[model samples]
Target chain A: SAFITFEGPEGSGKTTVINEVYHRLVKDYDVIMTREPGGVPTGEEIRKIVLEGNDMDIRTEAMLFAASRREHLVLKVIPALKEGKVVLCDRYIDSSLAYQGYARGIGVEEVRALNEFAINGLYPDLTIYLNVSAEVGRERIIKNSRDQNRLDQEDLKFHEKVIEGYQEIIHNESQRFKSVNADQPLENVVEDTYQTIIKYLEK
Target chain B: SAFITFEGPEGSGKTTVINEVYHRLVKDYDVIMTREPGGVPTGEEIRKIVLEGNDMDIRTEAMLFAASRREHLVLKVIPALKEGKVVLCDRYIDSSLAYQGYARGIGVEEVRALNEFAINGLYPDLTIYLNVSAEVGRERIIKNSRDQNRLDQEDLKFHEKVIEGYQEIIHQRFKSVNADQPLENVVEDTYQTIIKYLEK
Candidate 1:
């Protein structure tokens, strides 16, 4: 059984990578492909509330996200793990750290502490992190012109901060977080990501 | 100045008794009378979420109550008490013990254990319990035909359990309580009860 997550900020092309992995794995395993505030219906509703507003108080919004994450784990992820299914979550707690914490000046460690309480120490077995330069990632987003999300609205400074946040996370947990270069071409990126997953999945 | 609470189930007439005492003491002493999840905007909002029953889990509902109580304490009760005001809360944690704990089958001590975390061991100096008989209270509710709040709609069995629950709380802190009187003459009962304690 695998509890895997795909982690990256907006315009990192992690979404495309996840789609490829999901399409490949869906036939072979009972894989659950979902993003953060996923796994529970109520949690999805909470996500909608958090992302839909810039007016939301920062800490209050963090608490709301944590609460939703707690509910989602209790209702969806934990039970699947207990049943011994491969639960592939797109984003768990890392997105909160990168986006809301350091990038948004909300304190990544503080948010991470709150998220620990929420998940009750439910960490993913493996996390595939797609890393890309801010300039290159922005060009990709500008070219696509189709991706719309809360993260899509952030400026270059914010995206740079997010990349720094991810680097910090990687520095702290070097073994758990496997970084794949999104700057690489499609086939190479996919091959690198597949190798990372295969190392853990075959273990 | 002291902090005190009046606690019981519905139709127990705790409100009328508390009000009479409040009005009388207001002429001579500075006293603020209030209830749990009360006297603050955010607390009242959270209270609305809990009582409105817009489909919340029991533990989540309980957490909302705790959050409301926490907010109420931070914003209202603590400020007044720090100013040396005689704060007479109409209902507080004990009410939760009676209603959600024993009556609702969540267990008195368990709810109290969690709620104790919320209030952080802030107990009332004097607790005035206007204990009406279960049968008489039910008859009053039926005769008056008043709209029942969240806890009021529970059956006589639940009410009896709530009374029993209060009995246990009182047994632990017997000196703090004054009980068993009709609401019509409850003002005298409370006044005498407090005066006796004040002199001690």
Candidate 2:
């Protein structure tokens, strides 16, 4: 059984591509594609708390994410893995590493330390990095949104930092990561990701 | 300015004694008394999430506590310290160390690492520990309860381990007050300790 996580910055075609890959895999393999919370009761409550936060301390935000991750991992993903199912999680530790750790300037190592405890050494078997540019990702976010109204929005530099953070993680843990260009056409991204997952599952 | 935390077992008269001390200090000094959440919105919400346990994991609860502590410390305790007010907190880090870490058997250092991040090394200026026995503490709780208690559900053994955990881990750092004595003696012992420390 493989625990594979698809990680990318916002609009990196991660959710869309993972959905397709998960859809493709379900036909031939026993697979469960999920995100953080993964619809577990406690984790959903945690996400509710997380989504409702703006006036929060950085470390507190990080701790909540890690806490929710603990519930999701221990309950949903771990059980699936034990039952010998392929777990295609949308995001795992790398999201925290990039977004909270790097993009938010909370130190990747600091957040990593917190998550290492939350995760309790359960690193993903494989991490699928959907590589995309800040410019392209931002443009896609703008193009995809139904409501473009925003008094406050992400700084371009922040997105840049997120990409850099992912790169840093992939660089440090080269063995676990397999990168695919998310900037390609949707069909192409799906095909590559789908095939990539297939070979790993087969191997 | 001082950040004083009270550490005790469930029936160690912590709430009653801290309340009297807080009231006493409020008459003369800039003092703010609070417990974990301290009425902060984020902290309160964290507590609401924590109000469940059956299917919960230990580390999950610890992280939630650390999260709540972060919000409370940064927003409430930190600001109180800045305003030069005496923060009479009912409980803080050592409570987690004793209850969650040692009592729950999650390594103290592990929980300490998590909490160190949450508190960000903002340790209490002084920790007043209420030293009382498991037997005496339970008797107090049974006597105080208005609705004639069903004490069978309560584990006296667990409370003893809680006391053991606190004593083994926290007694070194804390100023232990003899909480076995009457309320006046215990209160004055605790009260004098705070005032004496504040004067320094």
Candidate 3:
């Protein structure tokens, strides 16, 4: 009967941990894994608009994302949570907070207010944040990834800003977050996440 | 160089007044007429999405409107304003504030904040609100298009609420003209007010 969310940048091994953690959690609990566009028709529609929209203003883009998030929350996440399930959302509000909010130079609290309106103030009950330095995150993504490219200064700074954004969010909503040191190896990160999640779930 | 928006519910003679007023304004000042989705490709696309989806969350619907508005403002309206044009928008933030915000039971201030965010503080330099009773409005709608068939108890109730919502948005630039009068007078009154503003 918990609504938990996962947060980290692309290379935080979040997808890997979420998959493994979801499977492992499924053995003992009622759990489901999801990310945005969250199988909602309206969400997919909004997502398509956002994706193909090449010349959208950054603020408009944020509005569209918030619009999609509301549909996903109403049509999918809330329904799952109401059924007393452990809804492990892959990414939720914080992604917007990090990318569009801080890194994109829209104030985090401003974007937070927009999202709060969208979600009807339904902040996640718990969030498992996998913490990693920008340097390490870029390295992980490049090491095992197919679209291998070197990071430019812009990319690094953006990533650093995103991490700082997350830090500010965690500081603000301290009660809702449990963080893992994702700078470790995959297995250790997984073990840390596994322990961190179940420890919260059991209590 | 001012941004003016026109607001009223259906049957408020808004279209006729705006049409006449816009034509007159361009004679004296650089002016252009537009509504949301206002020929911006992105706005049209968003409008398309909003129209196609019949069953949508009210908040989501408001958000989509805001998104469309942002595109229209940035891509169309703002550019025209920079060129020293008097942009006469058919409907703007007040439409969302009234219809989605008050008429739909979302608080007026809440929806105003959402739209304010969308427009990035680009409040209209002037807002011409064509005031009418719901009774007068529905009658005009019925008589004008014989979409008299479109009138329903539910429809009348919403029209009334939208009127009430319009009242809540009072500002110095938000000029309310007596649209319940005869058509020629309504148009003349609206046109005169706008011309007076432009000349000032």
Report fnat in order of the candidates. 0.00, 0.77, 0.69
Q: What DockQ do the predictions score, one after another?
A: 0.10, 0.71, 0.79
Fraction of native Cα-Cα interface contacts (under 8 Å, chains A and B) also present in model 3: 0.69
Task: Look at candidate 3 and tell me the lDDT of residue B28.
Answer: 76
Instruction: Report the lDDT of model 2 for residue A179.
Output: 91
Tens-digit lDDT track of model 2 for A1-203: 99999999986888789888888899999998888888888888887877888866778888989989999999999999999999999899999999999988988877888988899889888888999887788887767878864313556677788999998898874667899998988789899888888888888
Predicted candidate 3 versus true structure: per-residue lDDT over B89-170, tens digit per residue: 9899999989999999988877887887898889888888999988899889888864447687888899999998888876
Q: In candidate 2, how many Å is residue B55 off?
A: 2.4
Model 1: per-residue Cα lDDT over A17-136, one tens digit each: 888877777777777776666746666655565566454455545655665666667777888888877777877788888877787786766677656546656788888888988877
Write model 3 residue lDDT over A1-203, tens digit each, in one string.
89899999877999899999989999999888888878888898888887998867899999999999999999998889899999889888999999999999987777877887798889888889999988799898788667777877887888889998888877764668898999999889999989987888888
Kindly indicate the candidate among 2 and 3 with the higher TM-score.
3
Instruction: Give the number of colliding residue pairs in candidate 3.
Output: 0
Q: Name the lDDT value of residue B94 in candidate 2.
A: 88
Tell me how far the alpha carbon of residue B187 in candidate 3 is from the true structure, in angstroms, after superposition: 1.3
lDDT comparison, 1 vs 2, better candidate: 2
What pairs collide in candidate 1? Answer: none
* Each model's lDDT: 0.70, 0.87, 0.87
- What residue pairs clash in candidate 3, if any at all? none
